[PDB]
Amino acid sequence: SITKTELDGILPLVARGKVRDIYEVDAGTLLFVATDRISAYDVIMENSIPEKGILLTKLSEFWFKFLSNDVRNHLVDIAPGKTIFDYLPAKLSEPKYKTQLEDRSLLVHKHKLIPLEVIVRGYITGSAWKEYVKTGTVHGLKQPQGLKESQEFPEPIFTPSTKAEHDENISPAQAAELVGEDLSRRVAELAVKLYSKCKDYAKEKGIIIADTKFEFGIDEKTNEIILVDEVLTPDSSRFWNGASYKVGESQDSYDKQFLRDWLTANKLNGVNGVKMPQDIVDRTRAKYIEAYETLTGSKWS
Ligand SMILES: Nc1ncnc2c1ncn2[C@@H]1O[C@H](COP(=O)(O)OP(=O)(O)O)[C@@H](O)[C@H]1O
Ligand SMILES: Nc1ncnc2c1ncn2[C@@H]1O[C@H](COP(=O)(O)OP(=O)(O)O)[C@@H](O)[C@H]1O
Ligand SMILES: Nc1ncnc2c1ncn2[C@@H]1O[C@H](COP(=O)(O)O)[C@@H](O)[C@H]1O
Ligand SMILES: NC(=O)c1ncn([C@@H]2O[C@H](COP(=O)(O)O)[C@@H](O)[C@H]2O)c1N
Ligand SMILES: [Mg+2]
């Protein structure tokens, strides 16, 4: 696994997130490296999921391409026949570095981010289900009565969260407080549009995208929302098998929920330094790969 990139100062480190190591290529561009780290409940596991970051990268790329006519994205154009390494200092092609970067790195434009987790829910689960059972709303929004667990909403819904300790689910109205009324509506509508397109596509492939978290940037020069971060990965989404889908209960996970649930079941949610047993590593990895393969129609290996 590539757990922590070690680039020996060749590029400045902008950040490490839970998953990504982000370096500055230049003033406008980031080397956006998805490591193999995995986190749940905002805590990184001790051990990694080998090549998860490659999957997140590749799957993101798939979706960026799928959505390329629907939304601008943060990817830097790589000229034909070139690789990201052509756009990096030569030293990063040396194997010590290249092995840490290849297939898990995106060269992206630094964007001003819209400070929301742009969650779209097509189906009620997770935190939405928890809230709905209580008060019949999601992120404060009113809903039809009688939804059962995992049921499809009548229409997918934008249900933002803050970008945090833990992210906070907020209403669209509160999101508009944060980001502006016009922008928030644009975000909502675009997110739902993107989600729905992907949902429909995925459904035909056999996957229900229950929900997903997008991240958007804003290019204030062109007044364009930019799809940034990762897109429709099993970290950012819940993927259910359509054929096994059954409302009124939880679904099999093809996504991080498997790990989340395992941690919770084992009273390890929130605990740092958790070593996923190999079985859990493997099962998680395999679930992610299954999602990847089904969604993309391509083989992982
Ligand atoms: N194009 C971009 N420009 C700047 N920051 C970005 C861009 N795309 C994503 N990001 C940010 O890069 C980080 C990605 O790393 P990640 O490990 O996913 O972080 P997190 O732990 O917050 O989820 C996040 O802070 C994300 O918002
Ligand atoms: N214990 C918690 N209580 C409330 N919200 C949480 C909790 N843990 C994580 N979250 C939030 O749920 C979302 C998903 O987190 P999760 O994927 O499970 O951990 P990570 O975000 O590091 O991968 C994030 O917005 C995160 O901030
Ligand atoms: N912004 C980018 N960062 C890293 N790799 C990229 C980027 N854009 C394209 N690629 C890679 O270049 C190759 C051609 O991709 P594409 O032409 O976008 O289908 C693929 O292997 C991509 O992974
Ligand atoms: N901060 C995050 O990475 C994040 N925040 C939300 N999500 C995704 O948003 C969806 C809704 O999550 P929840 O039901 O826990 O609010 C799930 O697919 C979840 O993985 C994320 N990936
Ligand atoms: Mg992230």
Side-chain angles (χ1 to χ4, degrees), residues 44 136 208:
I44 300 168
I208 291 171

Side-chain angles (χ1 to χ4, degrees), residues 95 109 117 130 140 156 200 233 259:
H109 292 284
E117 306 296 5
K130 279 173 155 146
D200 288 349
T233 76
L259 174 62

Side-chain angles (χ1 to χ4, degrees), residues 194-209:
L194 300 177
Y195 167 83
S196 284
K197 179 175 172 166
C198 297
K199 181 192 40 89
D200 288 349
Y201 164 82
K203 188 57 170 66
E204 187 279 335
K205 298 299 197 182
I207 280 177
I208 291 171
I209 308 177

Side-chain angles (χ1 to χ4, degrees), residues 1-19:
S1 285
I2 302 307
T3 291
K4 181 177 177 173
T5 63
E6 294 288 358
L7 301 190
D8 292 322
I10 290 162
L11 300 174
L13 182 65
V14 172
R16 290 195 172 88
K18 292 181 296 298
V19 170

